[PDB]
Amino acid sequence: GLVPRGSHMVGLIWAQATSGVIGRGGDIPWRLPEDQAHFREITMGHTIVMGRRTWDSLPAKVRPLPGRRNVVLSRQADFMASGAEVVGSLEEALTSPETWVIGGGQVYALALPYATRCEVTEVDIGLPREAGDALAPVLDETWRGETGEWRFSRSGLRYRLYSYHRS
Ligand SMILES: NC(=O)c1ccc[n+]([C@@H]2O[C@H](COP(=O)([O-])OP(=O)(O)OC[C@H]3O[C@@H](n4cnc5c(N)ncnc54)[C@H](OP(=O)(O)O)[C@@H]3O)[C@@H](O)[C@H]2O)c1
Ligand SMILES: CCc1nc(N)nc(N)c1OCCCOc1ccccc1CCC(=O)NS(=O)(=O)C(C)C
């Protein structure tokens, strides 16, 4: 369904291990180049919102992510995010008709109450939760959606896509 341009659709998009781990040591603890393709089709041409630590985790070669208005949340007024914009709270981050929150753990939790879509790649990797891990947000019972089929990446890693939505 098309988004009426006067509304404010907020989506979250992330990839997680079975356990819910999404981040560890300032990085994503797997590599799934196939997952980048879905990430691009979902986010291209819209505003993307990320926490400062996720900005730090982006490779300099793709930073800011092209074709998208990059917004970084930080409480550091002097933060340097070249080619992006830095806002100090959530309200000014979510002003676009369509916004995709692209991480990390803190900012997913912050934005979830306002979101009506989650695009979730589940990676079949057994990484138990560890102290300091960044984690996927917990979805309450208002969400619903579709579970995709498992597929192998070129590397042999198995993954599948969940598309969740709510009113
Ligand atoms: N698997 C995935 O799909 C995926 C996607 C993205 C990221 N990641 C990984 O997730 C990890 C990063 O997640 P994280 O939870 O540690 O950090 P994060 O959510 O990316 O960023 C946290 C930072 O955002 C700022 N912030 C948080 N709440 C704010 C608020 N209400 N107002 C203003 N600023 C706020 C603060 O920046 P300041 O400290 O500068 O004040 C805070 O330190 C990394 O490991 C990353 O590689 C994984
Ligand atoms: C792709 C990981 C990911 N997957 C999902 N499903 N949701 C996320 N929020 C997520 O993290 C998005 C932020 C982390 O992004 C990373 C991390 C490592 C290497 C490169 C990057 C840039 C991403 C990139 O290359 N994007 S792209 O549009 O293909 C164009 C910039 C090449």
Curated annotation (Swiss-Prot):
Pathway: Cofactor biosynthesis; tetrahydrofolate biosynthesis; 5,6,7,8-tetrahydrofolate from 7,8-dihydrofolate: step 1/1
Binding site for NADP(+): 14-15, 22-27, 51-54, 73-76, 88, 102-107
Annotated TM spans: none
Chain positions recorded as substrate binding sites: I13, W14, A15, D35, R40, R68, Y108, T121
Superkingdom as given in the UniProt entry: Bacteria
PROSITE patterns: DHFR_1 (PS00075), DHFR_2 (PS51330)
Reaction catalysis annotation: (6S)-5,6,7,8-tetrahydrofolate + NADP(+) = 7,8-dihydrofolate + NADPH + H(+)
Every DHFR domain range: 9-166
E.C. number(s) listed in UniProt: 1.5.1.3
GO molecular function, one term: dihydrofolate reductase activity
Pfam families (UniProt xref): DHFR_1
Primary enzyme class: oxidoreductase
The UniProt record lists the keyword Secreted: no
Family named by the database record: Belongs to the dihydrofolate reductase family.
Functional note: Key enzyme in folate metabolism. Catalyzes an essential reaction for de novo glycine and purine synthesis, and for DNA precursor synthesis.
Name of the protein: Dihydrofolate reductase
